[PDB]
Every structure is written in structure tokens, then in C-alpha cells.
Amino acid sequence: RKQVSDGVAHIHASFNNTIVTITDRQGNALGWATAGGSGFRGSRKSTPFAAQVAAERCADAVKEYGIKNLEVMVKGPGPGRESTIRALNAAGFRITNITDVTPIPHNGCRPPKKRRV
Amino acid sequence: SLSTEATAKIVSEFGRDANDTGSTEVQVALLTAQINHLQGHFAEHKKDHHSRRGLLRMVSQRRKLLDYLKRKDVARYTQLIERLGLRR
Amino acid sequence: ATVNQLVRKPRARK
Amino acid sequence: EIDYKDIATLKNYITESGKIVPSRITGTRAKYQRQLARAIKRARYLSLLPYTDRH
Amino acid sequence: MRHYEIVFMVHPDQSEQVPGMIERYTAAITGAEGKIHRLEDWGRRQLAYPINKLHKAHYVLMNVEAPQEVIDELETTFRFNDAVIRSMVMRTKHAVTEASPMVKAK
RNA sequence: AAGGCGGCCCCCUGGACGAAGACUGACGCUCAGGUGCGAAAGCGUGGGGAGCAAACAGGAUUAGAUACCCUGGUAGUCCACGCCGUAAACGAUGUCGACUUGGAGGUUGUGCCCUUGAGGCGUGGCUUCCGGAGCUAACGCGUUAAGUCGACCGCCUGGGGA
Ligand SMILES: [Mg+2]
Ligand SMILES: [Mg+2]
Ligand SMILES: [Mg+2]
Ligand SMILES: [Mg+2]
Ligand SMILES: [Mg+2]
Ligand SMILES: [Mg+2]
Ligand SMILES: [Mg+2]
Ligand SMILES: [Mg+2]
Ligand SMILES: [Mg+2]
Ligand SMILES: [Mg+2]
């Protein structure tokens, strides 16, 4: 219904959940898929295999725009950083750019307390 | 402390020549003009207690130098206390 | 330990 | 002696993300290392070197 | 007397007003016994990161040897004028007369 | 000086250290009371308010959860103006001076040298790790002493009560 042919993947990687989101170069969102609704809950949600099927399912909803060259924007220190990039190549795409966009503050705000166990 | 024109002049004011710079009466005048230079500074900067340590050092340094001339020759002592406005 | 300290106050006998 | 204007010297002393390389890797003197640190921070205000590789 | 290096950049849409600002600020400095050592125009210059949503900033580099009279007024008229978006002054060690590496390469 | 102090730039201002000489001539050391500074919390007045976070709200946990964990959240954290003057305020070593084998370094200068390289040779200020003699109850200290001495001041006299 529309042709853009330029993808941007703002993928999220937290310790609890990994979120894959395809968008364009101009901020207009094109589709998302989270590992919480992929049949993975809690401990199964914090698995790198959950990021393997989340990237493939989000890619299946953005093939209506005919995207061939995409950019990968990696955001977060969570696991699954490798399993979500290889799933983009298994979905029949031409990988062009991979960029770490993890936010690093310059000691802006105070971090929370420790979690002693 | 001061600039070069302010330092070399007061040495020539109170010294016998240009080499008369190490004597006690010159050293009082170096501390007297410096405390008089810092009158308007510490009024505006009362929260600067670190520069106040340098100020109170020169007050204690000048008091020890006035006690040396007073115990040796009171003739030169009574000259300098009114020439700089001392004894309050 | 100093003799001049004991000039002001001697050793306090219990 | 060193100055902020010669950015080609500053290109040899930063990373691709604009991060300052310490004297452990380059093996420079510690007198210049404090001078090179403030020289980049002058160029950082004047938009001569990028802060991060984000923008 | 102090030695200042005055760095100020000009809005790129008013780059023709730059030679007006050169000689108006010069007469106020040199009248009160202010020397001058370097006056170099660079034109537009690509930014390392965008500031005030603009690109291709104009750069003018200066060296002014002058007392503390002009350091009070000139920093206020930089904030008063809207053409100068960034103003930066710094104290140097001596009066210096040397071409910048931007002029020696362009 | 210590508690401490970290974006950049300007203004005001403090001490420390090195080189070359000139100059005053013991002008010094030390410190009871006294004086000032002094982490953070807290208090008074008036502002300010992101984030974090006592009390507290809610959910799990549990025998109970008051705590832990999680979602929120006031005082406070921020600034001005005071007051409070306590810390494991520790190098757990009061200050000052004099000497007594030394290395690995760091920092900061200075002097000379086929400048024959940011080097060679010295020589002061600051600082860490080893270690001989010696000392110490051991641990360790060991040219920055807890080695050998001098000058002065503070403090301790079984534990608990306290
Ligand atoms: Mg000074
Ligand atoms: Mg003599
Ligand atoms: Mg209260
Ligand atoms: Mg809690
Ligand atoms: Mg309050
Ligand atoms: Mg106590
Ligand atoms: Mg220790
Ligand atoms: Mg031994
Ligand atoms: Mg040892
Ligand atoms: Mg008792």
C-alpha cells in the first residue's frame, strides 16, 4: 500500500524483555513485536530464543512496504543481542548498518539503591 | 600580592635604596597594603573561608613583625604606626 | 612523660 | 605549546566515538595528558569534535 | 595587561553582517589602549554536531590585548545580540601572533 | 590545615614549589584557656522540585513481614539566610627540627651535554610499593619511622557501671 524501502530497527534489550520495532528513517513506526506475547512468560521471556522469534514475527508484518535495506539500532544491555540480528538475515533481508544506540548518561540523575540478596 | 609597580614603589618609599627590601619595616608595608587591598573582597565574599585563612595568616605575620621593632627600637616603631595608620 | 607537663598537674594518685 | 586548533593531533588522541584515549595506550607524558584533556573540552564547546557516535 | 583569545561564531544567514561587527568592536577596544594581534575570517564551517537546529556555522577567530574594561561590555552585547549563538573567551600566556591551522590549510 | 575538592569560560582571591642573586639579622619553635573552620543527618525562615528516597500507601514473601523484593510516595536531598559542631572526622600515628644502607616507580622542576630523538648526566619539591641494620608483643614500621635524640602540648590507669 506504500513503498519506503528504507528500514530502521530500534530493537530493545532489557534484562526482563526484548522488544523489536521496525520504523523508517523519519520516525514513522511500521511495526513491533514483544517477547511477552510470543508465548514466553517470565523466565522464558528472558531467553535469547525469545528474541529469535520476536525479530522474525516483527519482520513478517513489515514486508508490505517492500523493505530490503534496513538499519539495526541496538539499545540496551540485556541478553539476546546476537539472536535478534541473525533472525533478521534469516527473514530474507540485506543487512546494511548495525549501530549501538544504548543511552549513556553523563551522571545526570542518581541511580537507585542496590539489590542485596 | 600586588603588581610590579605597586611592589617596587613602596620598597622605595620606606627603604634607604632599591636594595633595602628585606628589612622589617618594608615587610610590614607589604602586609599593610595587602590587608587594605582585601577590605572590599571579604565583605562581598564572607563565605570564602579558605581565602580567610590566607588573610588571617598575614594578620598574624604582621603582628609578629611589629613586636620585633617594638622590643628593639621604639623610635622607628612610633614612626611606622602612624605613617600607616595602626594601633587603632 | 614530660616534666614540664607535671609542673601544671602532678601524677594523680588513686 | 599544544593547542586546541590543530584538530588533526586531536583526531589521533580520540576514538571514533569521540572518547579520550588515556596515556596507557598512547604512551604520552602526564604533563601533556592534563593539557590534552582540557584542550579537547575547549573544542567540545566549539562543535569541533563529536561527543558520541550517537549523533 | 591581560591577553585574551575571543572566539565567537555568527549565525549563517547573517554572514554578510560580519565585516560590520569587526570594525565597530575594534574602535571601542583600540580607543581605550587595546591592542590587536590576530583577525582571521574563515567563512562557513561544517559542525561536528548540530546546534540551534542549524548547519554550516560561520567562524571568526580573534586575539585581543586589552584591559578589563572591554571584558565587561563585549560579553554582554554578545548575549544581547541574537546573531552570535556561542561566545567564548579565554586567557592566554602572552601576546601571540601566529596563523591558525585553518588558514594555513585553506 | 582538615572535613574535603571534578563540564567548560570569565572576574576576584589564597597557599605550595623551583632557579639566580640581593636584603633584614633569631625576627624562632610550641601551645592551657580563648578564637575560627569543620562530612552527612536534623532544626528555624523563605523559595525550589526532575530523579532518588525515612515515615507511610499497595502487592508478594511468611508462622507473623513490621524488614528483605517490587509498584508508588511526603519530609529531606537543591538555593538563600542562620543555628546545630557531632563521625570508623583513620595514616585508627599531635606539631617542629637534626642525623642513620638502600631499590622499583609515579608526579613536578632545574643545571649541563657529539641538541647528534620526546634522549645522556646530575640535582631539589611531592607520593606509593618492597626491604637491610635497628626497633616492636607480634602484625609490621624501616630516610615520609612505629630507628637513634631534642623542644613543647594533649591524653590513658582492670572490665562493666559510664
Ligand atoms: Mg599566586
Ligand atoms: Mg648586614
Ligand atoms: Mg523541622
Ligand atoms: Mg522497601
Ligand atoms: Mg529544610
Ligand atoms: Mg568523637
Ligand atoms: Mg591503613
Ligand atoms: Mg631484614
Ligand atoms: Mg618496609
Ligand atoms: Mg573506671
Domain boundaries, chain B: 1-88
Nearest residue on chain E to D49, judged by CA atoms?
A: E48
Hey, what's the cell of B58?
Answer: 598575614
* Euclidean distance between CA atoms A35 and A17, whole angstroms: 6
Hey, what's the cell of A30?
Answer: 511500521
Distances (CA, A) of C1 to B58, C4, C9: 36, 9, 12
- E80 CA from centroid of ligand 9 (Å): 64
Within 8 A by CB and 6+ apart from D53, the residues are A99, A100, D16, D17, D18
**3-state DSSP of B20-61:** CCCCHHHHHHHHHHHHHHCHHHHHHCCCCHHHHHHHHHHHHH
Distances (CA, A) of D54 to A6, A73, A80, D14, E20: 19, 10, 21, 15, 38
Q: Which of A59, A67, A87 is nearest to A6 (CA)?
A: A67
Give the side-chain half-sphere CA count within 13 A for E92: 21
* Euclidean distance between CA atoms A10 and A99, whole angstroms: 10
Q: Which of E89, E51, E97, E85 is nearest to E70 (CA)?
A: E89
Q: How many domains does chain D have?
A: 1
What resolution in angstroms does the PDB record give?
5.2
The verdict on E92 touching D (C-beta cutoff 8 Å) is no
Whether the Cβ atoms of residue A74 and residue A20 lie closer than 8 Å to each other: no
Residue linked to cell 622607628: B76
Nearest residue on chain A to D54, judged by CA atoms?
A: A101
Residues of chain D found within 8 Å of residue E50, distances taken between Cβ atoms = 55
* Euclidean distance between CA atoms A104 and D18, whole angstroms: 14
Give the angle subtended at the CA of E102 by the CAs of E85 and D27, to the nearest 5°. 100
* Euclidean distance between CA atoms D50 and E47, whole angstroms: 9
Sign of CA dihedral B72, B73, B78, B80: negative
* Euclidean distance between CA atoms B58 and B39, whole angstroms: 13
Beta-bridge partners for E33 = none
Is D15 buried (19+), middle (13-18) or exposed (0-12) by CB count in 10 A? exposed
**3-state DSSP of D3-27:** CCCCHHHHHCCECCCCCECCHHHHC
Protein-to-nucleotide distance from the CA of E20 to the C1' of F53, whole angstroms: 56
Say how many C-beta atoms besides its own lie within 10 A of residue E5's C-beta: 18
Sign of CA dihedral D2, D7, D11, D12: negative
Give the angle subtended at the CA of E78 by the CAs of E52 and E41, to the nearest 5°. 80
Whether the Cβ atoms of residue A5 and residue A66 lie closer than 8 Å to each other: yes
> In chain E, after which residues does the backbone break, taking C–N over 2.5 angstroms as a break?
none
The amino acid sitting at B72 is K
* Euclidean distance between CA atoms B15 and B6, whole angstroms: 14
- D48 CA from centroid of ligand 3 (Å): 50
Domain boundaries, position A27? 1-117
Is E52 buried (19+), middle (13-18) or exposed (0-12) by CB count in 10 A? exposed
Ranges of each domain in chain E: 1-92
* Euclidean distance between CA atoms A73 and A99, whole angstroms: 5
Distances (CA, A) of E5 to B86, D10, E2, E24, E64: 44, 20, 10, 18, 6
> In chain A, after which residues does the backbone break, taking C–N over 2.5 angstroms as a break?
none
Q: Report DSSP state, residue E79.
A: H
Whether the Cβ atoms of residue A65 and residue A5 lie closer than 8 Å to each other: yes
Protein-to-nucleotide distance from the CA of B46 to the C1' of F83, whole angstroms: 17
What SS3 class is residue A62?
coil
Pick the CATH number of B1-88 from 3.30.70.3270, 1.10.1040.10, 3.40.50.12280, 1.10.287.10: 1.10.287.10
Whether the Cβ atoms of residue D51 and residue D15 lie closer than 8 Å to each other: no
Residue linked to cell 554536531: E49
Whether the Cβ atoms of residue B70 and residue B76 lie closer than 8 Å to each other: no
Within 8 A by CB and 6+ apart from B62, the residues are B28, B31, B32, B35
User: Would you list which residues of chain D are within 8 Å, Cβ to Cβ, of chain E?
Assistant: 5-8, 42, 45-51, 55
